[PDB]
Amino acid sequence: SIVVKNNIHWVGQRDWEVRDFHGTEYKTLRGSSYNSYLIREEKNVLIDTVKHKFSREFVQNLRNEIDLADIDYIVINHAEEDHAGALTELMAQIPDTPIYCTANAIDSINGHHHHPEWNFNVVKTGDTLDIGNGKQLIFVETPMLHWPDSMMTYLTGDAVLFSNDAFGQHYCDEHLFNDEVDQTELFEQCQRYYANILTPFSRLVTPKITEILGFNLPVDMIATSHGVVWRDNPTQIVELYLKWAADYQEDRITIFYDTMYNNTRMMADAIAQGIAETDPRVAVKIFNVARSDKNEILTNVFRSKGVLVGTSTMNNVMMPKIAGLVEEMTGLRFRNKRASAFGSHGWSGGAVDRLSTRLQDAGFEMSLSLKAKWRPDQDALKLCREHGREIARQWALAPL
């Protein structure tokens, strides 16, 4: 194990090979980690666990650190499989150990493990737990961040905020602290995390952070359930969350599409040029949804002021990958963004209008659509380049 601070010991699990989270909806390109902590004062407290597949390693490593019978309290900030998956394995050795968690946590913990006979202790915001030596744990309820059972645990004296998922990122490294890792790679994974997971709950992030800051509690470190431990200016990740939650957007336009014969692709490239030559301030990214990483697309959309989505008509409907991605954006609930649909068709078409409607349903302020028949000739590409001009002038953050 690794010493986090004083009597705080990291007993989690690094996952270098992991590439798929939430099934296949979140690609972890730089691996991930599952942070579990063992506090050893007068009382011994285990905070969260690890993935189920590493349950055997978790219990064995935990034995080498401390006798399982000497563990007093178990804390579950979150009952998702990647944090409470090894719970059943552990409770088999110490079934009488009390479990501190939220009321919703009992529903989620029992929902996965089916061991309601366990000794649960429902906690709510303001509740405290003495561990001796003048130190105590303070619990803060954070429902829908990102789960109904989510909560944070604060350790007095050491000033360590166990935030679980919050302020975490999927980044695997042998070093434990934020000031010991690559800053660029760290920022990319942090932003990648919020944009794909916490975006729809942005309206709850600001008020909750304000509430926690209102407690006037000192924060020396922020120990999340994923990635590094924030010790050097740990409040920096909290500030980013404040910015990201405020309907974050840069002067950027993201264009993505699906194509069978590149007709729609040629439209996208023409649109980008029309934008770039109209507003040099705007950064432009283009992705083929079939050839690109879905999570990178969503991260840019989160950063963008507006997007253009392209699709060709296939059997009177839009292409499946485009339909699927739009369905996903509807769940993320992006705010204060604009959208414009485009694409090519053969005869009757109809996929472009279909897509435009669903983008509006997803919450985007819709501009006019751009349509073309078969492969665009020189005259058609002028219109597509013109469409980019019209979009750039409309979506301008400032004059000129």
Ligand X SMILES: Cc1cc2nc3c(=O)[nH]c(=O)nc-3n(C[C@H](O)[C@H](O)[C@H](O)COP(=O)(O)O)c2cc1C
Q: What residue ranges bind a second copy (CB under 8 A)? A: 22-25, 81, 104, 108, 111-112, 114, 147-148, 200, 258-261, 290, 294, 314-325, 327-328, 330-333, 346-347, 373-375, 377
Residue placing its CB nearer to Fe ion in the complex, 82 or 296: 82
Determine if 215 is a binding residue for ligand X (CB under 6 A). Answer: no
CB of 127 to a second copy, least distance (A): 22
Residue placing its CB nearer to a second copy in the complex, 64 or 347: 347
Determine if 82 is a binding residue for ligand O (CB under 6 A). Answer: yes
Among 5, 43, 51, 78, binds ligand O (CB under 6 A): 78
d(CA 374, CA 237): 48
**Cβ 345 vs Cβ 312: under 8 Å:** yes
d(CA 77, CA 6): 22
Residue placing its CB nearer to ligand O in the complex, 22 or 393: 22
115 is catalytic: no
| Candidates 64-72, 256-264, 292-300, 390-398; binding stretch for ligand X (CB under 6 A) | 256-264
Q: Which of 82, 149, 173, 279 is catalytic?
A: 82
Q: Taking every pair of C-alpha atoms in the chain, what is the biggest distance, in angstroms?
A: 79
- Of ligand O, ligand X, a second copy, none, which one sits near residue 382, judging by CB under 5 to 8 A according to partner kind? none
d(CA 63, CA 74): 15
175 is catalytic: no
Q: Which of 48, 165, 173, 258 is catalytic?
A: 165
**Cβ 228 vs Cβ 171: under 8 Å:** yes
Q: Which H helix or E strand runs over 8?
A: strand 8-10
146 is catalytic: yes
Determine if 83 is a binding residue for ligand O (CB under 6 A). Answer: yes
Among 215, 346, 360, 365, binds ligand X (CB under 6 A): 346
Q: Quickly count: other Cβ atoms within 10 Å of residue 121's Cβ.
A: 14
Q: 321: which 2 tokens?
A: 């990958």
112 is catalytic: no
Residue indicated by tokens 């279909």: 354
d(CA 9, CA 35): 10
**How buried is 114 (Cβ within 10 angstroms: 0-12 exposed, 13-18 middle, 19+ buried)?**
exposed
Q: Which of 48, 80, 258, 390 is catalytic?
A: 80
CA 134 to chain CA centroid, nearest Å: 36
232 is catalytic: no
Q: Which one-letter DSSP state was computed for residue 261?
A: S
Give me the residues that bind ligand O (CB under 6 A), please.
Answer: 78, 80, 82-83, 165
**Residues involved in catalysis:** 22, 78, 80, 82, 146, 165, 193, 226
